[PDB]
Scaffold this active site. Structure first.
Site, PDB file in Angstrom:
ATOM      1  N   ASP A 176       0.223  -7.076   1.649  1.00 37.70           N
ATOM      2  CA  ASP A 176      -0.059  -6.491   1.485  1.00 37.70           C
ATOM      3  C   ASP A 176       1.924  -6.125   2.036  1.00 37.70           C
ATOM      4  O   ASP A 176       2.472  -5.705   2.969  1.00 37.70           O
ATOM      5  CB  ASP A 176      -0.562  -5.319   2.601  1.00 37.70           C
ATOM      6  CG  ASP A 176       0.294  -3.712   2.957  1.00 37.70           C
ATOM      7  OD1 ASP A 176       1.055  -3.516   2.087  1.00 37.70           O
ATOM      8  OD2 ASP A 176      -0.368  -3.054   3.860  1.00 37.70           O
ATOM      9  N   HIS A 184       0.607  -0.975   0.164  1.00 38.95           N
ATOM     10  CA  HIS A 184      -0.002   0.163   0.394  1.00 38.95           C
ATOM     11  C   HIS A 184       0.907   1.160   0.075  1.00 38.95           C
ATOM     12  O   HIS A 184       0.040   2.518   0.058  1.00 38.95           O
ATOM     13  CB  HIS A 184      -1.147  -0.345   1.219  1.00 38.95           C
ATOM     14  CG  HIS A 184      -0.882   0.137   2.122  1.00 38.95           C
ATOM     15  ND1 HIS A 184      -0.345  -0.335   3.147  1.00 38.95           N
ATOM     16  CD2 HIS A 184      -0.325   1.682   2.601  1.00 38.95           C
ATOM     17  CE1 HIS A 184       0.503   0.189   4.701  1.00 38.95           C
ATOM     18  NE2 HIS A 184      -0.184   1.351   4.433  1.00 38.95           N
ATOM     19  N   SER A 200       3.504   2.993   8.197  1.00 39.12           N
ATOM     20  CA  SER A 200       3.442   1.794   7.355  1.00 39.12           C
ATOM     21  C   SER A 200       4.892   1.438   6.297  1.00 39.12           C
ATOM     22  O   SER A 200       5.616   2.138   5.680  1.00 39.12           O
ATOM     23  CB  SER A 200       2.892   2.318   6.288  1.00 39.12           C
ATOM     24  OG  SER A 200       0.978   2.531   7.711  1.00 39.12           O
ATOM     25  N   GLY A 201       4.719  -0.007   6.376  1.00 37.28           N
ATOM     26  CA  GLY A 201       5.830  -0.361   5.479  1.00 37.28           C
ATOM     27  C   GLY A 201       6.866  -1.035   6.135  1.00 37.28           C
ATOM     28  O   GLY A 201       7.943  -1.579   6.179  1.00 37.28           O
ATOM     29  N   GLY A 240       2.296   6.872   9.132  1.00 39.83           N
ATOM     30  CA  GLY A 240       3.456   7.253   8.007  1.00 39.83           C
ATOM     31  C   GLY A 240       4.931   5.840   8.565  1.00 39.83           C
ATOM     32  O   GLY A 240       5.463   5.419   8.188  1.00 39.83           O
TER      33      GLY A 240
END
Ligand SMILES: [Ca+2]
Length: 223
Positions: A84, A40, A177-178, A175
């Site tokens: 994801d 995402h 994320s990942g 922020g």
């Protein structure tokens, strides 16, 4: 990260910032030329920033390397966030040292109750907005699959796990994320989604990296 602590400069040496003019997602360095992040977080025009602590100040340990190729998982579903995960190839190899280092992929899946380290530059408030400039850290356990499914009925697949605190107060947030979830020195999760941040009975949800090791290895070997 809500309810965490300041990690300390370069204490999380595999943490990446993905930059498109500004920080927008984290990632993890898994070898000198490849980063893993959340699907995402996909966009064109990514610069990978290694060796960062303060993302607004050049402190001397940074390496800034453009992406040459991004590969979103073949079965990523943006509506459910199943699968994801994304790989990013760097245009040139990073220079590895004590402050910029890769994180190992797991050989086995981690069990509920294992303590992990989650890190990122995301929002530090559960109500309102305050973005830090330096890297924040949180220690949190993996929750049982039953508690995770009870918190998010109908939404948890076999490719997800929950980690955090059912009482709230400590979580990943926008922020982050990942970014990485590291347990016993191995990358076990990717910051994926949740309902708000740090709310009671709504822990963070993470991509279960151990299900993807074969895909990661085969993709790197051929790209
Ligand atoms: Ca910096």
């Amino acid at each position: 990260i809500v309810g965490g602590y300041t990690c300390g400069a370069n204490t999380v040496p595999y943490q990446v910032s993905l930059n498109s003019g500004y920080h927008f997602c984290g990632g993890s360095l898994i070898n000198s030329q490849w980063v893993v992040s959340a699907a995402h977080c996909y966009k064109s025009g990514i610069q990978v920033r290694l060796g960062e602590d303060n993302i607004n100040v050049v402190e001397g340990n940074e390496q800034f390397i453009s992406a040459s190729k991004s590969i979103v998982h073949p079965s990523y579903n943006s509506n459910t966030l199943n699968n994801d995960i994304m790989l990013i190839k760097l245009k040139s190899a990073a220079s590895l040292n004590s402050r910029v280092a890769s994180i190992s992929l797991p050989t086995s899946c981690a069990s509920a109750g294992t303590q992990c380290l989650i890190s990122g530059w995301g929002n530090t408030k559960s109500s309102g907005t305050s973005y830090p400039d330096v890297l924040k850290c949180l220690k949190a356990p993996i929750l049982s699959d039953s508690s995770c499914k009870s918190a998010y009925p109908g939404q948890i697949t076999s490719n997800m796990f929950c980690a955090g605190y059912l009482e709230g107060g400590k979580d990943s947030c926008q922020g982050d994320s990942g970014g990485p979830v590291v347990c016993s020195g191995k990358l076990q999760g990717i910051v994926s989604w949740g309902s708000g941040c740090a709310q009671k009975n709504k822990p963070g949800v993470y991509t279960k990296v151990c299900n993807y090791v074969s895909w990661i290895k085969q993709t790197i070997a051929s790209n």
